[PDB]
Write a protein that binds this ligand. Structure first.
Ligand SMILES: [K+]
Ligand SMILES: [K+]
Lengths: 681, 681
């Protein structure tokens, strides 16, 4: 574990045909093109002019992001009017960043982590088209409100403000290479100590997606909507729509904290072509070759140890041979040719098109998934190599199969390239990640009942589909790594299968649900016989209980072993008092009601005075003792916490999970309400 | 000299009332407000509606950037149609960056330096207003051309492409704090080794500057166009227009290379407020306090050693007390209160208004000039302290005088703050810079005759006004640190006064001028007697001559001392041959013509064959020997180089200046042609 290695500890994406990493992996491993073909009816509905449809140069297809118009404004405390004004690219980036942090297992509203964010969005066609006329005929006040909801500057800071990211929050833009430049700056920030975690990401969404495009020979776009990277029939790409983000942390920190490591960034490099090329928009062999070599040098990774490269890969007749010539030059720099056919080459642009500002996210996230799965996937629309590409001069070949990624003398390593219009180039070196008994309280919360139900079904489903999940990790991730919201649910479970079923059934006997309407509860210290089996179980199983019980027995003047065996009022008091103090230590602020104190010793009376126990409440009461023939021990205590917490009591989950190693794991992400917010031009 | 210290080795600015650093220092030291008041006639000319003029809330004033519409497209190889399309913010940033590199003394078209650029521009109102209708009714091809000439992404890369910057070139945007964030990332890049030099800067230009504004109580803008920072009558600021850039290099490198150090950046910090504040646009004491403390810690600078702070300083009733409360908290963090009245506080927004994206450049450059001049300057419109500001809790007081900056126990140190809408905060620690015989060839070149004449007058003027300038440094800076352009001029001078006069007079006897029209010249090796005084002078004074003369004497079979004394044809040959070889070693590619070889020895014939001397030219001839009663020695040789170079011969000025330490110094910057490029809405 090198000092400079950066872990990818979470990620998220909404790309054409894939709203999550799991569905993206399905697109990739199944070798599918996500191109949408538009009917004439759909194009007419979209206001495409009739001469345009008739034109044989017009391409009736696109790479669309479904529900780009949807946004859960309520969750983010944003009004309808404001949601409508905000560029969909910024809305989608905000939800995507939320998802990435969720998958990482970190709730930035809690904890001491300092989280930065580097992000960029594409050309704001929402402002130009949908809000265009609105802008030029508006007051300075309303123009100002449109500026802070639409200018590029605000994508990173809106996210910082709404998610609570206190590290550097910077909008970074270099056109098609924006994604990997953001990744580069995030890593630089992390290594310099600006922050302890960082998001890096990008969004590109055309306000008029859903329409086709006119083919022009002087431009990068293909005549048929297909992107045939490295193929002899390569004729360009299709602009796509999408958004992606990764969460980054020093690898040593990630391992120490017990995070899931999806992959390791070994090094990154960024440069610019400068002047020495035939035009501002022209490609450059030398600029590309240099940034690849620079990234490998920084990563301390020899070119012969790289076994996959994710090319920028736009399928232009000029650009494809240049990209391979540049890779050959970089890879062969330390001598002569590497073994032919020894490094796979591919382009996700063949699946989802060219995501512009977000292209590098689609490329990096594909490569991360391949590495985590130790699985190579196809580059599509490849039938025969472009004769002008000099494959024989180097190690590259275009992989067209889903298959095991063969082991090598080093861990599996990949390169990821992204080259922008304007000549800023980026290359990132990524490595596969290093190799990796009682009941638990599972807690869920959402901003609406409907969201809570969906989240419950999602978790149930995820739990059924992976039995290998550790219930501990699931409980910890849910408690520590999810926003604390008003509609709440909880369940005490004995294992993953058990949990899956209980959550699916929704049977109130086990599944506790409460919301902001329900009354804040009190804990009731009752009379009743002792509970020796229950007392002994908590004493053995719960360290916090054991502490306060020992100290309570000291005050009462009786040995702990005596009280734990006892059936009398002193014993019943002790168990309940110790439970109440353990709850308090875990952050509970529920009042303790002790309504009947007659048959209690003076010491018990003082202890009740010390914690300021009320004599009554003016509020639902939760008993501190199990009912007869109810579950006892830790199962009871966890159910108690669950009942209080769902009803709005405070719990400090960090303190609650103190005594154990925490392991954060990927679980389903928030079911954002699909509310349409769209300004009509 | 700490490893992490960064030198500011050049800078440039066009702010209201100041098109250069020198004129900016005049605004600052003279305590002037650059606010422009608009007549009703001017406002009407600008298309301001009549109800608007009548409105008593309307403020008929602004902080305008003169000639924001002007751009030397020819110099940058840009067509008229393209120049018109490019956002004026990007045009102005491009010219400003050129100026900054010129003042630093580096021509990025030559040399091995790797230069990065981090820059941001403000809201593109040129695209929205001037090109708005044009965009929505244009083809996809023309929309694409408007995108690459107007989107934020392209400001840094356009500059990289047109100036030849091959380091990371990144557009960075965080609203009002953009400038110092760019500076922060440039320093991070430099310290990480992305590059060896870096530009950082920003431009903010409203397409409708020249109009007034309507006052709204819910906004940051003052009712009278004055910005009364920290005053009891503080009521906000005025939006301004401007552009600035700095050139950064590791301090150790700068000193080693002999650069001018204008100031030293000791440390920088960037953070974001996150969620814990009352609104997205609200201020935050804690965010500000943290970034100031973080910057000082990183700089290893104790708060008690800081004697000036350049505040964000926007003069809002809420914001001013908050900024001082935050500074107090940061400065007092290591104990109790520092001495009252011991650190000056000011805001350049009181001079030039709020330059938005460029505000931090105006603040940083003011602070750099103060430090270089060891002179404090006034913060304006300060009559009585705002009662709500807790000055007494800390060391701060508002300085209102131009006066010597008192020496202290450490070098003079300042802080510079910039806080953005969206909550990204930056603070930079700056320190004063460390303490610092023959003829010379001065070379000038421009892209037009008119520009060449203006540049000549400018240099003449600058030379008159500083006699302390070292002629050496002037010659080196001009030769190594200026773009090589087609209309050329040169002068051999014996000192600064001499140069100043010769350049002003323009007398062809001394001042050589030539352009692309003039013929590429040849050097002529003539017959004629020896020139013993001339030979001995070059031998003594020019190492390159001495080398080739020694070797030529070896070939001829005669001792060098004999030939240097000689009057014969062998001696005349030797001196001319050695001069020709010295020119070749300095990169000359002018043909050598030896038309009359009769009375030359065989050895001389072989030597002429070896360099492939022509027997004639089919071209003006320049003699390799001084004419009788002409200047001799180094003066002659330099005049020779000048004649060839002005006529288009190649010279490698790096090789030419090899044997000596180079010192780059500020000289006047390029006289960009004032051509208007402005799209009509
Ligand atoms: K070029
Ligand atoms: K808030």
């Amino acid at each position: 574990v090198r000092d400079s290695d950066i872990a990818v500890i979470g990620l998220a994406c909404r790309f054409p045909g894939a709203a999550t990493p799991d569905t993206f992996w399905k697109v990739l491993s199944e070798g599918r093109e996500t191109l949408t073909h538009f009917s004439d009816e759909e194009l007419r509905a979209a206001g495409v002019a009739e001469p345009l449809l008739a034109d044989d140069r017009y391409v009736k297809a696109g790479q669309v992001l479904v529900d780009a118009d949807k946004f859960d404004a309520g969750l983010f405390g944003i009004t309808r009017d404001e949601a409508e004004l905000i560029d969909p690219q910024q809305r989608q980036f905000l939800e995507c960043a939320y998802e990435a942090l969720e998958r990482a297992g970190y709730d930035p509203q809690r904890g001491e982590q300092r989280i930065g964010v580097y992000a960029g969005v594409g050309l704001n066609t929402y402002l130009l088209h949908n809000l265009g006329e609105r802008y030029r005929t508006a007051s300075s006040v309303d123009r100002y409100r449109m500026m802070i909801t639409n200018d590029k500057d605000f994508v990173a800071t809106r996210t910082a403000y709404k998610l609570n990211l206190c590290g550097p929050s910077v909008s970074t833009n270099t056109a098609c290479s924006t994604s990997l430049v953001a990744v580069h700056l995030a890593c630089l920030s992390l290594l310099s100590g600006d922050c302890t975690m960082a998001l890096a990401g990008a969004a590109h969404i055309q306000a008029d997606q859903g329409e086709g495009y006119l083919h022009h020979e002087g431009m990068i776009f293909s005549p048929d909507g297909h992107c045939r990277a490295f193929d002899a029939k390569a004729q360009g790409t299709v602009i796509g729509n999408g958004v992606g983000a990764v969460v980054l942390k020093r690898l040593s920190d990630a391992l120490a904290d017990g995070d899931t490591v999806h992959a390791v960034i070994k090094g990154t490099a960024v440069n610019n072509d400068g002047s020495d090329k035939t035009g501002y928009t022209a490609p450059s062999v030398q600029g590309q070759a240099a940034v690849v070599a620079e990234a490998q040098e920084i990563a301390d990774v020899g070119p012969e140890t790289v076994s996959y490269v994710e090319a920028h890969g736009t399928a232009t007749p000029l650009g494809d041979p240049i990209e391979v010539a540049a890779l050959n030059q970089a890879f062969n720099r330390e001598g002569a040719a590497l073994a032919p056919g020894s490094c796979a080459l591919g382009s996700v642009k063949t699946n989802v098109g060219h995501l512009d500002t977000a292209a590098g996210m689609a490329g990096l996230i594909k490569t991360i998934l391949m590495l985590r799965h130790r699985t190579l996937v196809p580059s599509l629309c490849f039938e025969a190599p472009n004769p002008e590409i000099d494959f024989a001069a180097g190690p590259f070949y275009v992989g067209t199969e889903t298959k095991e990624w063969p082991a090598g003398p080093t861990p599996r390593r990949a390169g990821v390239s992204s080259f922008g219009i304007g000549g800023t180039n980026a290359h990132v070196i990524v490595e596969e990640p290093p190799a990796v008994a009682g009941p638990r309280l599972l807690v869920l919360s959402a901003n609406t009942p409907a969201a809570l139900d969906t989240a419950t079904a999602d978790l149930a489903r995820a739990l059924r589909k992976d039995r290998d999940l550790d219930l501990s990790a699931v409980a910890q991730t849910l408690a520590l790594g999810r926003r604390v919201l008003p509609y709440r649910r909880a369940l005490v479970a004995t294992g993953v299968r058990d949990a899956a079923l209980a959550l699916a059934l929704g049977d109130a006997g086990r599944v506790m649900t409460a919301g902001p309407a329900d009354e804040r509860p009190v804990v009731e210290l009752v009379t009743g016989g002792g509970t020796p089996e229950h007392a002994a179980a908590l004493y053995e199983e719960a360290a916090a209980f054991r502490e306060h019980f020992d100290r309570c027995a000291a005050e009462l003047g009786t040995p702990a072993a005596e009280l734990l065996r006892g059936h009398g009022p002193d014993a019943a008091f002790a168990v309940q008092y110790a439970t109440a103090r353990a709850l308090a230590g875990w952050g509970s602020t529920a009042p303790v009601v002790a309504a009947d104190r007659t048959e209690l010793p003076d010491a018990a009376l003082r202890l009740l005075d010390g914690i300021g126990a009320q004599h009554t409440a003016g509020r639902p009461g939760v008993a501190l003792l199990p009912a007869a023939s109810a579950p006892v021990g830790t199962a009871f205590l966890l159910g108690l916490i669950g009942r209080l917490w769902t009803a709005g009591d405070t719990v400090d989950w960090t303190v609650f999970h103190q005594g154990e190693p925490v392991r954060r794991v990927p679980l389903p992400t928030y079911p954002f309400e699909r509310v349409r917010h769209w300004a009509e031009p």
